[PDB]
Amino acid sequence: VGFFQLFRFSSSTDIWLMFVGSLCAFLHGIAQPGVLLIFGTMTDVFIDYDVELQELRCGLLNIESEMIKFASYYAGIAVAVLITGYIQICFWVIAAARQIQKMRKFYFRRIMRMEIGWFDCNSVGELNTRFSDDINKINDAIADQMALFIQRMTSTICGFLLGFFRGWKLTLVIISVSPLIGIGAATIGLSVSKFTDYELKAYAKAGVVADEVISSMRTVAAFGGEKREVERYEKNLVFAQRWGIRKGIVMGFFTGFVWCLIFLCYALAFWYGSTEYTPGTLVQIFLSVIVGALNLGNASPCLEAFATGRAAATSIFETIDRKPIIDCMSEDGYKLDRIKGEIEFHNVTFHYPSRPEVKILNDLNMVIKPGEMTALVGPSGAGKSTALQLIQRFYDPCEGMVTVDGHDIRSLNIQWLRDQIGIVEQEPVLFSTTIAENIRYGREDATMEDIVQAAKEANAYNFIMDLPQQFDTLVGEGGGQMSGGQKQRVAIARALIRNPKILLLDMATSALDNESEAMVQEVLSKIQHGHTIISVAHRLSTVRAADTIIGFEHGTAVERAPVRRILKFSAPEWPYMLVGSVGAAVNGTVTPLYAFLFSQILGEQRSQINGVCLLFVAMGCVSLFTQFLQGYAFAKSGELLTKRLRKFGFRAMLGQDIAWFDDLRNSPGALTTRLATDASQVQGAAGSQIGMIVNSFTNVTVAMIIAFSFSWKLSLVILCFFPFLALSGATQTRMLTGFASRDKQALEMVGQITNEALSNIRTVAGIGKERRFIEALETELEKPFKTAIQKANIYGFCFAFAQCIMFIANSASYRYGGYLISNEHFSYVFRVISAVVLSATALGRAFSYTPSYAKAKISAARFFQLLDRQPPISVYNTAGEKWDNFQGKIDFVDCKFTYPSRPDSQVLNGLSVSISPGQTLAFVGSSGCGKSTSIQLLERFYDPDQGKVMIDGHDSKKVNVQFLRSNIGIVSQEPVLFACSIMDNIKYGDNTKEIPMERVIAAAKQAQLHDFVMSLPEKYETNVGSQGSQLSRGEKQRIAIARAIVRDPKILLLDQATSALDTESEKTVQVALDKAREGRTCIVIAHRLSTIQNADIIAVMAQGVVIEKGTHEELMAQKGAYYKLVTTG
Ligand SMILES: Nc1ncnc2c1ncn2[C@@H]1O[C@H](COP(=O)(O)OP(=O)(O)OP(=O)(O)O)[C@@H](O)[C@H]1O
Ligand SMILES: Nc1ncnc2c1ncn2[C@@H]1O[C@H](COP(=O)(O)OP(=O)(O)OP(=O)(O)O)[C@@H](O)[C@H]1O
Ligand SMILES: [Mg+2]
Ligand SMILES: [Mg+2]
């Protein structure tokens, strides 16, 4: 993008701030040539004073009056430089902050406004990484590097034109060589922009990997994939590291080339242009050479910033200006009144944008009557959810048209249309907030009476009146801190609160027991009179009350100490730090050495020109290598340090226990932005900042050494001032840390909000609350704005104070030197001491690196607190009992457990069941009785408070976690997947070693998956999408079963393994699962009692304790709770 398109979000006030700050930066830049002029005048008057002393009109001119005059001039320029520096830094920072805030708001608005298929083709980790890092880089490009670049540019141009205005026919060569510098700068800018593009692509890939791995923590722990994920992260880390070192190399070459050219150019100029000049003119010429070279060399980080900003803004602008095909927030359309509910299909044909080669809907024709219940039935993959989504205008038909009461869906207002549809998805998804808030997302004006009535109708009221925080308990993120049936009932309430006209049910009772199913069916039967209900069913029991049934057959419808820690951590990069330190030490020493040698050389017949030219060429020659060395070494050290930080952080994050991830302050959004941003913040201080610091320190040290080498009374007076500089630096660091302390909480919260919004676009679109999430993001973003406007003042004032106290020190030195001259050859001593102290004037800019220092401090502190934690269940711990012959005998003895997130609610009350090896147990009961909790305890995701579980006579709390986990096969209530092929998803079962193709094929065959995957254009290579969301839920359950089976585990865990695949007209998957459970210990929990018919032992669990136990015949004969559960349906 164009460099001046980065300001496309500016308003009039922003333009005013930029103009005023730029004027102040121009004055600050021209401050230094005034210093050159006064030094030249002082030299002239010094020689004019000592000529008459050499002699002995004359006697009329003294020294003290002019010395006080010079001191007053240095006081005036110091006041001016303080004012101008403060204004420039402050104003540029405000302008940048306002622009960045506006662009972030616009980016999120445009992303939310997009259509569903675009989200199918784009990963949420990509967008999160962009929103976190690329806009930050854009901000870094235009914040204050812009002002510093302007100041250095005006200082260099004025140092050049000093020779033109004062002096003549000596600056003929800078005009000759400037275009070469221009082309060099342009080419290096293009190169580093390309390298930046590659670097951000690599970091975006790494961000996607981290997001998926962190959001799939239970699965990645169950199947032991930590090593695979750390390697997967490290690959992208290595790629980005290579691009970063290339950037450092090219930049270091640019800086060294600039220095060497400049010095070589002026050496040749002094060689030939000599063929009149007072010594003061020579003095100011030599020092103008240095000011030009130094500021030109120091401008390079600004060029880095601008090119990185353009490269980063490319993709952000491309996303921001895209026009979506289907706009959920557009006004255009029609809003009819008095809808009846008749919806028809007309020869509809559809293919997903992700798989365009598959015809999923093929010439469909169905009619849905008003005020009736119509049930859709068919096998898995028959395109029922596709029609369900096409009704909502999630997509558009390729051919054909679906009408609502005789009107094309495309011709109606999308907001009004979607505000009349009540949807329950196959897997209800809740947002991390209270229960009443989650239910109220259906209708914002819903009162507490409305919420409680919706909960009562949804058969959810009792289980939330049995909670400690009734209606105010946090459901957790994604509703994870909830049971499946409870989550489903909350979703039913959220759907029914709106009182919709088109009520839509996608397996509305999948995770419900028969009693709650009966209650919900009674409510639906009461409601059925008015609204038109469309529900997909797999069982005839719910079909009993449906008026018409439509069958789907493959797309056709037929009716009926952080600093010390960092220093120790960065030990491996010691040689690069050593070489960079040596190079920057030489670079610091060369300047005062030049001042001394030049001042010596001046005080013109023989060999003086040869000496001058030889010195110039030697300095250019040395400076090229040393500047290159400094830049390259420090860039390499920073890159390696950040790579190691990211790798170790991801490893430590993966090594934590499941209760740590259940913390409400440990969300994947927060952890992802933490991992993405802490390393970058540390980089911003561990890069070339250290090289600049050591360069400046070596400069000041050498300058003071050779100042004290001549007269100690003036050098002491000069050294008297530096405590003020140290105090200013410390104060800035203190306030910066104070602000960053809460800046990081604000950043984590905005990251959590944006990830929760992006990851569940389908749910947010279904309920239609697009505005609420954008408003919440803006509200959470408004918090750091005040902090930013407050830190701008601190930064500007500290920078200005340092630069001002330097000139104060110079004026005081002039006054005291005048006193020493008048009171007590001292003119020569003062000349050389002033020369070196002026050559040592620009080293005090140690406040450019300070604003990043506090960020690095806080980030490193938090990183080490995360790194040094000891989990209660350490999966990286190699200590624990192991026995060679495993048998899979499991028994609970008086197991009790309470969730750490809900300490006032005990879930398990003395669980005690036993299983002999080779037997299966069926856990039956109501929803939320702790059935999945026992499985979590078995998988050592948690540990019982009192009581214990024994595996083959070994207490579970002393057996190795990896060893135990290798012997278990688990399927979850809501299985999850990774965004890769079906093949790799199956291969994930055994992560220790590769498994042959034959085993995968066999597992797929026994999982009833081979035919469907054979039907795909890519057989076993098709991408499944993020979380495996680009498949119907039946095939997700089937791939989960295949992945569990492929391990051949001694313990097999089945949690509602037939929830989605429920077509019971054929006895095939039942035989498949029976053969799977053959010959091994299995625990199978299922709310449908026909599939657990043949279990050896059936345990009925109520309120965390087992109340019945036996086989099917004894439990049936006892007429207990099992008889009522069976006979109720
Ligand atoms: N986003 C997507 N990208 C590609 N293919 C998809 C996507 N969503 C669904 N499909 C495919 O569409 C077909 C039917 O999906 P759909 O979810 O409508 O089936 P279904 O009859 O509702 O199944 P189930 O009974 O398992 O819920 C399947 O082949 C599935 O893989
Ligand atoms: N991570 C969690 N943190 C806190 N409470 C939880 C958590 N997971 C579940 N619960 C609660 O513990 C109780 C039992 O949960 P569990 O998931 O074990 O039930 P379940 O018997 O398997 O139910 P269902 O048949 O609905 O799946 C419920 O009240 C549920 O809301
Ligand atoms: Mg479905
Ligand atoms: Mg469960």
Numbering used by the authors: 45 to 100, 128 to 346, 353 to 637, 739 to 781, 790 to 1010, 1013 to 1317
Paper lines:
BSEP (ABCB11) is an ATP-binding cassette transporter that is expressed in hepatocytes and extrudes bile salts into the canaliculi of the liver. BSEP dysfunction, caused by mutations or induced by drugs, is frequently associated with severe cholestatic liver disease. BSEP has two transmembrane domains (TMDs), each composed of six TM helices, and two nucleotide-binding domains (NBDs). The NBDs of BSEP are predicted to form one functional nucleotide-binding site (NBS2, consisting of Walker-A and Walker-B motifs of NBD2 and the signature motif of NBD1), and one degenerate nucleotide-binding site (NBS1, consisting of Walker-A and Walker-B motifs of NBD1 and the signature motif of NBD2).
Human wild-type BSEP and a variant in which the catalytic glutamate of NBS2 was replaced by a glutamine (E1244Q) were expressed in HEK293 stable cell lines and purified in detergent. No ATPase activity was observed for BSEPE1244Q in detergent or in proteoliposomes, even at elevated concentrations of ATP and TC. To capture BSEP in a nucleotide-bound state, nanodisc-reconstituted BSEPE1244Q in the presence of TC and ATP was prepared for cryo-EM studies. Approximately 60% of the particles adopted a closed state and yielded a cryo-EM density map at a resolution of 3.0 Å. We observed tightly packed TMDs and NBDs in a closed conformation. No substrate binding cavity is present between the TMDs, suggesting that this conformation may represent a state of post-substrate release. We observed two distinct EM densities in the two NBSs, each corresponding to an ATP molecule, which is consistent with the characteristic architecture of other ABC transporters. ATP binding is mediated by the Walker-A motif interacting with the phosphate groups and the A-loop interacting with the purine ring of ATP through π–π stacking. BSEPE1244Q represents a state prior to ATP hydrolysis, whereas vanadate-trapped BSEP represents a state immediately after ATP hydrolysis.
